[PDB]
Design a protein around this ligand. Structure first.
Ligand SMILES: Nc1nc(=O)[nH]c2c1ncn2[C@@H]1O[C@H](COP(=O)(O)CP(=O)(O)O)[C@@H](O)[C@H]1O
Ligand SMILES: Nc1nc(=O)[nH]c2c1ncn2[C@@H]1O[C@H](COP(=O)(O)CP(=O)(O)O)[C@@H](O)[C@H]1O
Ligand SMILES: [Zn+2]
Ligand SMILES: [Zn+2]
Ligand SMILES: [Zn+2]
Ligand SMILES: [Zn+2]
Lengths: 518, 518
């Protein structure tokens, strides 16, 4: 028997410092979690105890906090090198600052192999990322094959030169080449989501284990340690088409947990068994002093975004995925109110309605730090540098959008819409495409605004992110059927301006989105 | 036969200049109405044609616009003298600036008798107002007996020295004294409301006609000329207990109409018949040039309140009685939002709920003048100089208040509540005291504010006018059952500050108050 311990992270999203339990800024240090200093301590503890260890990342280190807005990936390469990661797979967010934003900060400075077998460039990038790497682990070798979401061209900015192939089609020839080289232990490490990960495990002959990301999937065996509810056991077992039991793992997001899987291999590289669980990186684990002092050094340049108080909140600003992708969330209401307020000011075409993809809200903000709101706090909520555009839509188009908002409800997908100037009621007992039971909107062609049923043949002006106006999140009907599209102001500046104007904010959940009982 | 024409006004409330159809500031002069210059032209036209004319006012000339805030009744005495009113009865609003605010500006400068038979002082005021006046009208005499709401001590500030008697009890001895003096034509002129006016007509032996006010009652015979819906025919006929047909008249409010009644008397002063209708003072009647030039002279001092733009509205600000005393009105929502915003700022005890008596909103604001909002526009909405106080109430107390809000619904009474941070649903099919079918409130002891059912044994912090905290509008339960009462900022300054902060406002009717179908 040859035992291998796989340590893994995914969707860290620039949470270099320890955070609050909800992955927002750490205020109460006594109860904070995650961060690269704490992760280091745990990884070192495991490396001291286990002789065959691999520390892997399944992508999306890029984007999420002021660390990335300021260092643009230099902090990723630096701290991933300090933690001595053995390999990383490319995620979609590694392409947000173009191919140039991946090459210079990360690919040229990473001391570990960076992988993706399904990205074919059509050179300069040649060899800076690899389809696989064969890693020596003691007296054995372990092959790691990478993969990246085939949806990256739509989700990010990888440019016209990179081609993204079907993951299964691109992986099988690389795995087969590893098998011809007598590499009998193979890990598929990549960034496509738990559903594709299970398909890779079922269909790619020769893959012994799948380490994934992108869906922020939390898996656990037994009673879980924090607020994340498990989507399945850890590992999730897939029975492959050739009859092998293949463990599939993921470790939520934001560096809150360290994925930990122990695999028992025979002499021919068959998985005899495996077990483990994600480790909660809570205050019980001390932050490594050396890494922490280096974090404090890099932190000095960021304190310019933490000194200006933009305003104050007397309520918890719920920007969590568990709220904003499933129901009305007060952060969504705040952002839509700021969006509506911004246009109802610098017009010289006035608008009363707002739609906002819940997945575009990427962090909550806590009210306990004397309720202070800084640019840094807002940078984690809106880390993409998008704009809030004005569009003219038909009622029929809006109805289709709201049907699309709940067409596959319950999967924590980002299309669920937050709103302003709209009162929507859904009936999830109904069939996809027929779940909107009520859709009232704030009249524009009226002297006193009031809510009236949306009319399919009428025309409404809606403020929304450029992501939705360009057909993102499957909102193809907006891009195809829109009658007008005007570019707007930068997302973060619109919310920043609105908070400074209000001074004290208290957004509520007030019935803009409801669910019927049937 | 001896014919008398009674011309009458009531509840003018400082509308010295012509106004918009809704009695707010005149912007589009082409379609404006009322004002003392237009009234003069009509009164003169009638005086030229009819030999026996009396021009009467049934009170509440005081309070309503910047004219009264600045001239404090000097404009009333001046312009009522210019129009040559024959008599006036004291209304409750004539006592808002104390007895001193009535004596000096009006009683000492009025060239016509000022009347009230049921006000007994317990001197200086002696003879400055009279219980009645016997007026020569051609070769005859007409007795006018005055009366004032017995509720004036609670509604206004008449002081501890004035006693207000039951109107019927005080009137009969004065009418009997007039009959002993062979005065066979008697008009009761007063300010107690249409219901008391009908009782006076039924019960006071010797009264030939009743000219009233206070309830802003619009009466009309036939198809009406504007948006006011008639509450009955003009005149309203009461059959007295001694079997006489007694006409009862009123002429809405704000100087929009001139009440016009022609009475045919026999030689013994019996009313043989009567007929007429309120005359709409619309653009068809020219404004008298002489009065208009004198109005323009007095207007120069007021233009300091019309030059500073506090902000802009892109919606009609519905502060009409027909909206705010019957359903959710967007002016009510604006004022409650300003009330909530004001305390959620200069705390150093935070509060999320607001209640506002609809009768405290005393004018709309139009959005068509490039949407401009001035101090003058706000002065007509909030003309009383009240404050928005903080109170701590039990849920049981709040439930009683909301039951009181609709206990006598449909009478255009001012207790109907406008709200903030509250979602109330009424069922008017239910019995008084049991009409609240749903009462949800914005949680305070929660990190994310949301609406939850009000709990009878819990405690809430509510911002409301001092008028309601002191038990006004029959809200005795607030004054008696409150747990804490902190005095607040001046009503007009709170709304002014909030509009300047927002710059562009667009309050909507959004479902804070609803009515069920049963
Ligand atoms: N450029 C943009 N602008 C946006 O406003 N939102 C975006 C934009 N890129 C994405 N997203 C949102 O992010 C969601 C995906 O988040 P996750 O489920 O955590 C997968 P990922 O983090 O990409 O691995 C999408 O469903 C979108 O709603
Ligand atoms: N001092 C105050 N402060 C207020 O906030 N509201 C007041 C205050 N005095 C009164 N009112 C309101 O005015 C309403 C009466 O208006 P109308 O029916 O037009 C009779 P009136 O104008 O008095 O002849 C009451 O029901 C109250 O709601
Ligand atoms: Zn991610
Ligand atoms: Zn991703
Ligand atoms: Zn009045
Ligand atoms: Zn009155």
């Amino acid at each position: 028997m040859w035992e291998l311990t796989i340590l893994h992270t995914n969707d860290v999203h620039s949470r270099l410092e320890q955070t609050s339990e909800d992955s927002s800024k750490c205020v109460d240090a006594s109860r904070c979690m995650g961060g690269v200093a704490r992760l280091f301590t745990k990884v070192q503890q495991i490396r001291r105890a286990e002789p065959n260890v691999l520390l892997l990342d399944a992508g999306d280190q890029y984007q999420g906090t002021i660390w990335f807005t300021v260092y643009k990936g230099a902090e990723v390469a630096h701290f991933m090198n300090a933690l001595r990661y053995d390999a990383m797979a490319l995620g979609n967010h590694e392409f947000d600052n173009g191919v140039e934003g991946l090459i210079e900060p990360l690919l040229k400075e990473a001391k570990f192999p960076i992988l993706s077998a399904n990205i074919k460039a059509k050179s300069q990038i040649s060899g800076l990322y690899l389809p696989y790497k064969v890693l020596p682990v003691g007296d054995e070798v372990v092959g790691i094959v990478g993969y990246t979401s085939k949806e990256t061209p739509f989700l990010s900015n990888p440019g016209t030169n990179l081609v993204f192939e079907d993951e299964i089609t691109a992986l099988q020839p690389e795995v087969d080449k590893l098998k011809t080289l007598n590499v009998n232990k193979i890990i598929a490490l990549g960034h496509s989501g738990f559903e594709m990960d299970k398909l890779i495990a079922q269909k790619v002959r020769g893959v012994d284990v799948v380490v994934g990301g992108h869906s922020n999937t939390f898996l656990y065996t037994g009673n879980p340690p924090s607020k994340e509810v498990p989507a399945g056991k850890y590992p999730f077992i897939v029975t492959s088409d050739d009859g092998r039991k293949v463990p599939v793992v993921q470790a939520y997001a934001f560096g809150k947990y360290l994925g930990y899987l122990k695999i028992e291999f025979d002499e021919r590289g068959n998985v005899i068994s495996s077990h483990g669980n994600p480790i909660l990186l809570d205050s019980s684990i001390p932050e490594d002093p050396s890494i922490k002092a280096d974090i404090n050094k890099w932190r000095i340049k960021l304190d310019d975004y933490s000194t200006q108080e933009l305003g104050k909140t007397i309520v918890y600003l719920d920007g969590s995925s568990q709220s904003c992708r499933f129901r009305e969330c007060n952060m969504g209401n705040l952002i839509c109110d700021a969006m509506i307020n911004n246009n109802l000011r610098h017009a010289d075409n006035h608008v009363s309605m707002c739609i906002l993809n819940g997945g575009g809200i990427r962090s909550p903000i806590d009210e306990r730090n004397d309720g202070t709101i800084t640019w840094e706090n807002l940078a984690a909520v809106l880390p993409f540098g998008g704009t809030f555009d004005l569009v003219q839509l038909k009622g029929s188009t809006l109805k289709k959008a709201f049907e699309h908002s709940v067409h596959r409800y319950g999967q924590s997908t980002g299309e669920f819409l937050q709103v302003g100037g709209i009162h929507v009621v859904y009936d999830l007992s109904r069939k996809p495409g027929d779940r909107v039971v009520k859709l009232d909107v704030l009249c524009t062609k009226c002297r006193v605004p009031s809510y009236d049923p949306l009319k399919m043949d009428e025309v409404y002006k809606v403020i929304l992110p450029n992501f939705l106006a360009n057909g993102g999140d499957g909102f193809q009907m907006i891009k195809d059927e829109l009658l007008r599209h005007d570019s707007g102001d930068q997302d973060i500046n619109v919310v920043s301006t609105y908070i400074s104007k209000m001074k004290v904010i208290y957004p509520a959940v007030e019935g803009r989105i409801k669910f019927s009982l049937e």
